Amino acid sequence: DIFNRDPRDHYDLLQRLGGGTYGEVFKARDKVSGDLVALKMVKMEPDDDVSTLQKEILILKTCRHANIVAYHGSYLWLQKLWICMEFCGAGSLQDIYQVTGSLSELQISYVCREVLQGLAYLHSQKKIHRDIKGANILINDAGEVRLADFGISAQIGAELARRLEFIGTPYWMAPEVAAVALKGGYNELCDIWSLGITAIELAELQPPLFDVHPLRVLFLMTKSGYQPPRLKEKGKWSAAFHNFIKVTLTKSPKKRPSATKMLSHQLVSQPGLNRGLILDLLDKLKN
Ligand SMILES: Cc1nn(CC(F)(F)F)cc1Nc1nc(C2CC2)c(-c2cncc3c2ncn3C)nc1C(N)=O
Q1: Residues within the annotated binding site for ATP?
Q2: List the disulfide bonds.
């Protein structure tokens, strides 16, 4: 499952694509097949024994779904874990919309249906993604939609930095998650709220309150009279899209629908939602 060797023995390392709390990601090519892959270098905590690491790589391998970037293999080299993953040629939805402008309502509907399929799978596996946003939804050259990873729950690498990252950028978290360090916990329904915010982000190029200081957003979201956000231009979007935002952004998690329930919402169950809508979006990159 995990190779005790240099990933460079099986791959040619190419350009660094980006990096964050999840690791450093590079473009790479398989030496034998010639196929493009993404190699992600994750620094390890010296306290995590190889049994702890193996338990997490087994999860990385078994927690599999068509709407989550596929895992190919791993390498333990120089106290670092290199993860080989499916190459998503068009980058994230943020990378795309910061060139193309706002996605169409049908494009957002397709993205939302595909992300809901991935979240319904992760929730069935008793995981909470807790990192849904446009930058963490990747697009391949075929127009397919994939979550970059299964979220923050990997008990390897910079887990603590990943877990606390939203405190400095809380715009996509549900109010029960924004109530950080208070007695109430949260459940998987926080992902449904994050998907509602991501739909507004795809429509408006930023999530609601993006211009507000992160500590002020945390202050506002724990106030009793806090109201969920809405789309800015009412006449630009259909009643179905406004209702999708209304129900995904239900303030109380005890009233917020599940990922499976959301899949029958009119916005994402309508006919004509396919990768061709995203192929049209990728065609806009050329102009
Ligand atoms: C082909 C390409 N282009 N771009 C745009 C850029 F500007 F970075 F180059 C990005 C890619 N590819 C990827 N980039 C990333 C991130 C460096 C941007 C990840 C990635 C992996 N693990 C966790 C992640 C990731 N993203 C967010 N989280 C939480 N994966 C892929 C990929 N599989 O193709």
Answers
A1: 17-25, 40
A2: none
